[PDB]
């Protein structure tokens, strides 16, 4: 019974985790279909009614089915995310908090800064009995025990980390044990660690991608009440297509400087508006009707709106939109005003924005080229140049594909973790201890087998 | 081997001196020659020493939003998990003996639906708390 | 085939002027500035079309009274009563206009939605006219570099 | 130009020592050798602290090395700065 329901639950979990990305693609395709259908949309005769014009008459049912399908796929995408990507986030968070507890004493010798949501929230997981639930190092509590027991108090460290002294002594001594069968609801409810689940739910809620998917689902649900809310799903193309990311990086790379450029433009335009409002106000009439003048610079705010809207959007500048100054006492001053406005605002600042985008392109290209050059000239691990190995034909490629392969190092770490401690060889035990203590001296730095056995080999 | 004082170390690690050092290094590397490199370095050292000595001489003489966010998380998650805490799941389990695969799939979907509803409540609570704080 | 069709219609001989790219190698280095980043150039246009569609959706839902394009009071030439017509208006004259869509739609002064429409026009000018065209120019310049 | 100048400054700072000017490879023959050299042996902050200590110290209590460096600094001759040489390079074979 229970073994069947849990097995089928696991099957559903596996299916959604497997098909998470395909459903994410399908959601984008369905969004493009819905928004293509919405392009043939006609407003009708006061209360305004929005009606889908259709000579075929079959685009309305198609739109309804597509909206329902999009809403279902959006929910399935959240389920797939929770099954697939949430465990990685939990593993990373548990590893980070465990390493901060052990090698920094984040909750023992220092304390969180009271403004870090992550640090303040990670207090809960320490006392839980399901700590490294996802992380492999299940002896982190014992490591903290050994490291800070003598100093900050064995009794206090035990209370902080939630290790009960009673259970260890109870198991060590003689005990009476009564098995509990999993068929019991009371048993399955007692098995749940409520505090750890609370902390996990908090981490998931604070995760950014989960929030994005929740926003996607909310948009999909609102699309049923108003079909034009489905247009917001077209903003998912940036994440959907990786080739769009290199284009968007030209803007996001220098986004702070781009925003500060707009701030500077707004300040310069405000200064020009101040000058115009103090001196040149007769030239800001915007009405042909002589009886009623539409004075655009009698107010500071109104004049600033005029300069920022039409002065900025005008190709020539503010002089393209304000009165001609010919035959006036302030002719030269106004001409200088307009010329300086055109030069500083229209020419220089827009050129600054364009240069920011172009420099972002160049920076990304240069970074990619530098990465390729470093990867092709020096080994990732030892750092020795390619020439020394290339003294032997194909020596550098042989070294980087057989001797110092980073994939081989990853496979070795996986094999050493999955292997039991009792069966470890001498070298494996050495590397395991050194990795547990986080000392990376075992990595060859500046030396290799060939360099050590230069003369013996040749 | 010589003595370095803690006051000197602190004044050197002041961010003002770090910015000055970065500017000096930039100037020397870009528009500086090797003949005058050491002379410029000594001039910079003298100026930095004087300004750190003067600084030592003159020297010798959000949280609410974070708390609201954690409170909203705790409250909303407790409301969600009161579902399990009620222990009234027995009347559902009476028919859990008699579910079909269709029903168990429905329950599987309903769990995630409840989680998403709790997330919506949490977001609304955070917005209300931020509005109250700024007001 | 173009040469043969030129006898039936002499203006088909104009298509043979497209052979200069292959004829002259010095033209190839100029054309490479465009062909080097052609995929990114096309995707930039796709992104521009999506952004303009979003702006058209916003205008069609809220700002429709401002899209009259006829001086004749009796007959209004309503350019945003249809989704497709409004999208054509924004992609044609909104994009081709130097200032943006506000250079071609009605003035919003003395209106309840004045601030919203002003933000709409300013954001349109900034994102479409300034940033995206700068992206295209930067693509060409980066190809040269 | 500004971006390229910043990149060049970073590259020079990461590849060659400020004082002696020897490349990073020679020190990197020993693991973390360049960083050890630039943070312990040839630290410009250490040179600044030495100049401050030598100025604040009185002349009568100067050691032989301190008197040498003090006279050379007063005469503005900078030959005491290691240029192209270091302790490891002088004691190549003795150390290893
Ligand atoms: N420690 C190292 N491990 C692996 N490759 C290294 C190492 N040091 C340098 N290299 C170089 O890095 C390059 C390998 O590149 P990378 O691993 O990114 O993928 P690839 O061979 O280009 O192809 P693929 O996309 O199929 O993975 C080779 O030129 C190799 O010589
Ligand atoms: N003589 C030298 N003294 C100090 N650093 C040197 C020297 N020669 C080269 N370097 C290199 O310069 C870098 C140090 O940079 P810098 O002193 O500007 O500050 P930082 O380490 O980047 O950080 P911070 O901003 O905290 O000062 C290191 O990579 C170091 O190896
Ligand atoms: Ca053994
Ligand atoms: Ca003496
Ligand atoms: Zn190597
Ligand atoms: Zn040095």
mmCIF file of C-alpha atoms in Angstrom, chain A residues 49-269:
data_model
loop_
_atom_site.group_PDB
_atom_site.id
_atom_site.type_symbol
_atom_site.label_atom_id
_atom_site.label_comp_id
_atom_site.label_asym_id
_atom_site.label_seq_id
_atom_site.Cartn_x
_atom_site.Cartn_y
_atom_site.Cartn_z
ATOM 1 C CA UNK A 49 -16.432 45.134 -26.276
ATOM 2 C CA UNK A 50 -13.378 43.219 -27.463
ATOM 3 C CA UNK A 51 -14.237 40.479 -29.973
ATOM 4 C CA UNK A 52 -12.073 38.006 -31.904
ATOM 5 C CA UNK A 53 -12.933 38.370 -35.595
ATOM 6 C CA UNK A 54 -12.901 35.014 -37.373
ATOM 7 C CA UNK A 55 -14.068 34.122 -40.863
ATOM 8 C CA UNK A 56 -13.309 30.474 -40.074
ATOM 9 C CA UNK A 57 -14.986 30.764 -36.671
ATOM 10 C CA UNK A 58 -12.596 28.235 -35.135
ATOM 11 C CA UNK A 59 -9.994 30.610 -33.655
ATOM 12 C CA UNK A 60 -12.026 31.299 -30.494
ATOM 13 C CA UNK A 61 -12.206 27.628 -29.368
ATOM 14 C CA UNK A 62 -8.557 27.269 -30.366
ATOM 15 C CA UNK A 63 -7.690 30.258 -28.174
ATOM 16 C CA UNK A 64 -9.646 28.849 -25.219
ATOM 17 C CA UNK A 65 -7.955 25.442 -25.483
ATOM 18 C CA UNK A 66 -4.553 27.103 -25.901
ATOM 19 C CA UNK A 67 -5.096 29.252 -22.805
ATOM 20 C CA UNK A 68 -6.069 26.214 -20.735
ATOM 21 C CA UNK A 69 -3.064 24.270 -22.062
ATOM 22 C CA UNK A 70 -0.705 27.150 -21.252
ATOM 23 C CA UNK A 71 -2.091 27.369 -17.722
ATOM 24 C CA UNK A 72 -1.602 23.612 -17.229
ATOM 25 C CA UNK A 73 1.939 23.614 -18.657
ATOM 26 C CA UNK A 74 2.904 26.546 -16.432
ATOM 27 C CA UNK A 75 1.900 24.563 -13.326
ATOM 28 C CA UNK A 76 3.697 21.484 -14.651
ATOM 29 C CA UNK A 77 6.825 23.642 -15.075
ATOM 30 C CA UNK A 78 6.691 24.615 -11.392
ATOM 31 C CA UNK A 79 6.296 20.945 -10.447
ATOM 32 C CA UNK A 80 9.243 19.994 -12.652
ATOM 33 C CA UNK A 81 11.350 22.777 -11.167
ATOM 34 C CA UNK A 82 10.570 21.626 -7.632
ATOM 35 C CA UNK A 83 11.453 18.028 -8.514
ATOM 36 C CA UNK A 84 14.649 18.803 -10.450
ATOM 37 C CA UNK A 85 16.376 22.082 -9.540
ATOM 38 C CA UNK A 86 15.302 22.585 -5.895
ATOM 39 C CA UNK A 87 17.538 19.733 -4.608
ATOM 40 C CA UNK A 88 20.612 21.414 -6.116
ATOM 41 C CA UNK A 89 19.735 24.692 -4.381
ATOM 42 C CA UNK A 90 19.224 22.892 -1.062
ATOM 43 C CA UNK A 91 22.508 20.983 -1.480
ATOM 44 C CA UNK A 92 24.422 24.194 -2.196
ATOM 45 C CA UNK A 93 22.845 26.024 0.751
ATOM 46 C CA UNK A 94 23.509 23.136 3.149
ATOM 47 C CA UNK A 95 27.125 22.860 1.992
ATOM 48 C CA UNK A 96 27.674 26.620 2.357
ATOM 49 C CA UNK A 97 26.149 26.796 5.847
ATOM 50 C CA UNK A 98 28.011 23.674 6.980
ATOM 51 C CA UNK A 99 31.357 25.013 5.768
ATOM 52 C CA UNK A 100 30.700 28.419 7.355
ATOM 53 C CA UNK A 101 29.818 26.684 10.634
ATOM 54 C CA UNK A 102 32.938 24.506 10.586
ATOM 55 C CA UNK A 103 35.710 26.663 9.080
ATOM 56 C CA UNK A 104 34.390 30.057 10.233
ATOM 57 C CA UNK A 105 32.140 29.438 13.251
ATOM 58 C CA UNK A 106 29.433 31.699 11.814
ATOM 59 C CA UNK A 107 27.081 30.922 14.723
ATOM 60 C CA UNK A 108 29.712 30.255 17.411
ATOM 61 C CA UNK A 109 32.574 32.753 17.303
ATOM 62 C CA UNK A 110 30.853 35.371 15.146
ATOM 63 C CA UNK A 111 27.204 36.090 14.351
ATOM 64 C CA UNK A 112 25.200 37.064 11.260
ATOM 65 C CA UNK A 113 25.091 40.762 10.424
ATOM 66 C CA UNK A 114 21.328 40.963 11.207
ATOM 67 C CA UNK A 115 20.740 42.338 7.698
ATOM 68 C CA UNK A 116 21.535 39.117 5.793
ATOM 69 C CA UNK A 117 18.277 37.258 5.180
ATOM 70 C CA UNK A 118 20.148 34.057 4.284
ATOM 71 C CA UNK A 119 22.338 34.144 7.383
ATOM 72 C CA UNK A 120 19.434 34.924 9.699
ATOM 73 C CA UNK A 121 17.246 32.215 8.149
ATOM 74 C CA UNK A 122 19.946 29.525 8.284
ATOM 75 C CA UNK A 123 19.709 29.467 12.097
ATOM 76 C CA UNK A 124 16.815 27.001 11.916
ATOM 77 C CA UNK A 125 18.568 24.236 9.977
ATOM 78 C CA UNK A 126 21.327 23.804 12.580
ATOM 79 C CA UNK A 127 19.129 22.261 15.277
ATOM 80 C CA UNK A 128 17.306 19.957 12.839
ATOM 81 C CA UNK A 129 17.990 16.209 12.860
ATOM 82 C CA UNK A 130 17.948 16.127 9.034
ATOM 83 C CA UNK A 131 20.981 18.377 8.446
ATOM 84 C CA UNK A 132 23.104 17.429 5.530
ATOM 85 C CA UNK A 133 19.939 15.867 4.124
ATOM 86 C CA UNK A 134 21.356 16.511 0.635
ATOM 87 C CA UNK A 135 24.987 17.300 1.471
ATOM 88 C CA UNK A 136 27.231 14.247 1.757
ATOM 89 C CA UNK A 137 29.246 15.234 4.849
ATOM 90 C CA UNK A 138 27.048 13.760 7.585
ATOM 91 C CA UNK A 139 29.747 14.249 10.255
ATOM 92 C CA UNK A 140 29.761 18.060 10.186
ATOM 93 C CA UNK A 141 28.135 18.175 13.630
ATOM 94 C CA UNK A 142 30.861 15.902 15.008
ATOM 95 C CA UNK A 143 33.518 18.058 13.330
ATOM 96 C CA UNK A 144 32.116 21.181 14.996
ATOM 97 C CA UNK A 145 31.946 19.147 18.205
ATOM 98 C CA UNK A 146 35.663 18.379 18.043
ATOM 99 C CA UNK A 147 36.723 21.840 16.876
ATOM 100 C CA UNK A 148 34.815 24.042 19.342
ATOM 101 C CA UNK A 149 33.880 21.651 22.161
ATOM 102 C CA UNK A 150 36.783 22.459 24.470
ATOM 103 C CA UNK A 151 36.609 26.211 23.889
ATOM 104 C CA UNK A 152 32.977 27.325 23.679
ATOM 105 C CA UNK A 153 31.675 24.492 25.839
ATOM 106 C CA UNK A 154 30.752 20.948 24.899
ATOM 107 C CA UNK A 155 27.345 21.443 26.534
ATOM 108 C CA UNK A 156 26.669 24.730 24.724
ATOM 109 C CA UNK A 157 27.816 23.461 21.316
ATOM 110 C CA UNK A 158 25.629 20.381 21.740
ATOM 111 C CA UNK A 159 22.607 22.569 22.517
ATOM 112 C CA UNK A 160 23.328 24.846 19.546
ATOM 113 C CA UNK A 161 23.721 22.002 17.038
ATOM 114 C CA UNK A 162 20.786 20.003 18.390
ATOM 115 C CA UNK A 163 22.837 16.897 19.132
ATOM 116 C CA UNK A 164 21.234 15.319 22.191
ATOM 117 C CA UNK A 165 23.601 13.681 24.676
ATOM 118 C CA UNK A 166 20.818 11.302 25.720
ATOM 119 C CA UNK A 167 20.530 9.398 22.428
ATOM 120 C CA UNK A 168 24.252 8.677 22.057
ATOM 121 C CA UNK A 169 24.556 7.268 25.581
ATOM 122 C CA UNK A 170 21.244 5.423 25.173
ATOM 123 C CA UNK A 171 22.457 3.665 22.022
ATOM 124 C CA UNK A 172 25.899 2.981 23.507
ATOM 125 C CA UNK A 173 24.394 1.375 26.616
ATOM 126 C CA UNK A 174 21.749 -1.373 26.597
ATOM 127 C CA UNK A 175 18.387 -0.261 25.207
ATOM 128 C CA UNK A 176 14.880 -1.587 24.594
ATOM 129 C CA UNK A 177 13.760 -1.127 20.984
ATOM 130 C CA UNK A 178 10.228 -1.494 19.602
ATOM 131 C CA UNK A 179 9.824 -1.461 15.794
ATOM 132 C CA UNK A 180 7.243 0.826 14.209
ATOM 133 C CA UNK A 181 5.643 -0.247 10.939
ATOM 134 C CA UNK A 182 5.376 2.343 8.174
ATOM 135 C CA UNK A 183 1.676 1.611 7.589
ATOM 136 C CA UNK A 184 0.807 3.837 10.564
ATOM 137 C CA UNK A 185 -0.300 7.397 9.841
ATOM 138 C CA UNK A 186 0.960 8.391 13.280
ATOM 139 C CA UNK A 187 4.361 6.916 12.402
ATOM 140 C CA UNK A 188 4.593 8.618 9.001
ATOM 141 C CA UNK A 189 3.547 11.950 10.519
ATOM 142 C CA UNK A 190 6.043 11.632 13.374
ATOM 143 C CA UNK A 191 8.806 10.811 10.884
ATOM 144 C CA UNK A 192 8.460 14.288 9.355
ATOM 145 C CA UNK A 193 10.985 16.873 10.558
ATOM 146 C CA UNK A 194 8.808 19.986 10.594
ATOM 147 C CA UNK A 195 11.630 22.457 11.278
ATOM 148 C CA UNK A 196 13.781 21.241 8.383
ATOM 149 C CA UNK A 197 10.794 21.338 6.025
ATOM 150 C CA UNK A 198 10.074 24.886 7.218
ATOM 151 C CA UNK A 199 13.654 25.949 6.470
ATOM 152 C CA UNK A 200 13.571 24.211 3.076
ATOM 153 C CA UNK A 201 10.320 25.957 2.154
ATOM 154 C CA UNK A 202 11.823 29.287 3.191
ATOM 155 C CA UNK A 203 14.865 28.723 0.976
ATOM 156 C CA UNK A 204 12.648 27.711 -1.952
ATOM 157 C CA UNK A 205 10.423 30.764 -1.455
ATOM 158 C CA UNK A 206 13.475 33.046 -1.393
ATOM 159 C CA UNK A 207 14.927 31.380 -4.515
ATOM 160 C CA UNK A 208 14.833 33.679 -7.548
ATOM 161 C CA UNK A 209 13.997 31.170 -10.296
ATOM 162 C CA UNK A 210 11.088 29.743 -8.307
ATOM 163 C CA UNK A 211 9.757 33.290 -7.929
ATOM 164 C CA UNK A 212 10.071 33.803 -11.690
ATOM 165 C CA UNK A 213 8.118 30.611 -12.362
ATOM 166 C CA UNK A 214 5.459 31.659 -9.836
ATOM 167 C CA UNK A 215 5.168 34.987 -11.666
ATOM 168 C CA UNK A 216 4.797 33.038 -14.915
ATOM 169 C CA UNK A 217 1.981 30.970 -13.393
ATOM 170 C CA UNK A 218 0.245 34.059 -12.000
ATOM 171 C CA UNK A 219 0.420 35.698 -15.432
ATOM 172 C CA UNK A 220 -1.021 32.548 -17.010
ATOM 173 C CA UNK A 221 -3.909 32.497 -14.519
ATOM 174 C CA UNK A 222 -4.650 36.196 -15.076
ATOM 175 C CA UNK A 223 -4.670 35.514 -18.816
ATOM 176 C CA UNK A 224 -8.012 33.753 -18.406
ATOM 177 C CA UNK A 225 -9.622 36.859 -16.904
ATOM 178 C CA UNK A 226 -7.953 39.063 -19.537
ATOM 179 C CA UNK A 227 -6.404 37.424 -22.592
ATOM 180 C CA UNK A 228 -3.861 40.217 -23.093
ATOM 181 C CA UNK A 229 -2.007 39.163 -19.935
ATOM 182 C CA UNK A 230 -0.611 36.323 -22.076
ATOM 183 C CA UNK A 231 1.585 38.915 -23.814
ATOM 184 C CA UNK A 232 3.792 39.108 -20.709
ATOM 185 C CA UNK A 233 4.949 35.542 -21.402
ATOM 186 C CA UNK A 234 6.789 36.807 -24.494
ATOM 187 C CA UNK A 235 9.356 38.285 -22.074
ATOM 188 C CA UNK A 236 10.585 34.714 -21.488
ATOM 189 C CA UNK A 237 12.523 34.574 -24.779
ATOM 190 C CA UNK A 238 15.653 35.955 -23.090
ATOM 191 C CA UNK A 239 15.840 32.852 -20.882
ATOM 192 C CA UNK A 240 14.463 30.550 -23.578
ATOM 193 C CA UNK A 241 17.122 31.286 -26.204
ATOM 194 C CA UNK A 242 20.812 31.434 -25.318
ATOM 195 C CA UNK A 243 21.640 33.245 -28.567
ATOM 196 C CA UNK A 244 19.482 36.126 -27.317
ATOM 197 C CA UNK A 245 21.633 36.318 -24.176
ATOM 198 C CA UNK A 246 24.731 37.553 -26.015
ATOM 199 C CA UNK A 247 22.673 40.388 -27.512
ATOM 200 C CA UNK A 248 21.107 41.323 -24.173
ATOM 201 C CA UNK A 249 24.518 41.228 -22.478
ATOM 202 C CA UNK A 250 25.536 44.281 -24.516
ATOM 203 C CA UNK A 251 22.937 46.174 -22.469
ATOM 204 C CA UNK A 252 23.175 44.392 -19.109
ATOM 205 C CA UNK A 253 26.991 44.492 -19.028
ATOM 206 C CA UNK A 254 27.049 48.278 -18.533
ATOM 207 C CA UNK A 255 23.572 48.722 -17.070
ATOM 208 C CA UNK A 256 24.684 50.782 -14.077
ATOM 209 C CA UNK A 257 26.640 53.180 -16.288
ATOM 210 C CA UNK A 258 23.679 53.302 -18.681
ATOM 211 C CA UNK A 259 21.328 54.353 -15.855
ATOM 212 C CA UNK A 260 23.806 56.906 -14.504
ATOM 213 C CA UNK A 261 24.085 58.358 -18.015
ATOM 214 C CA UNK A 262 20.315 58.943 -17.955
ATOM 215 C CA UNK A 263 20.646 60.561 -14.531
ATOM 216 C CA UNK A 264 23.329 62.888 -15.865
ATOM 217 C CA UNK A 265 21.139 63.686 -18.880
ATOM 218 C CA UNK A 266 18.250 64.542 -16.548
ATOM 219 C CA UNK A 267 20.509 66.865 -14.532
ATOM 220 C CA UNK A 268 21.842 68.629 -17.648
ATOM 221 C CA UNK A 269 18.312 69.076 -19.001
#
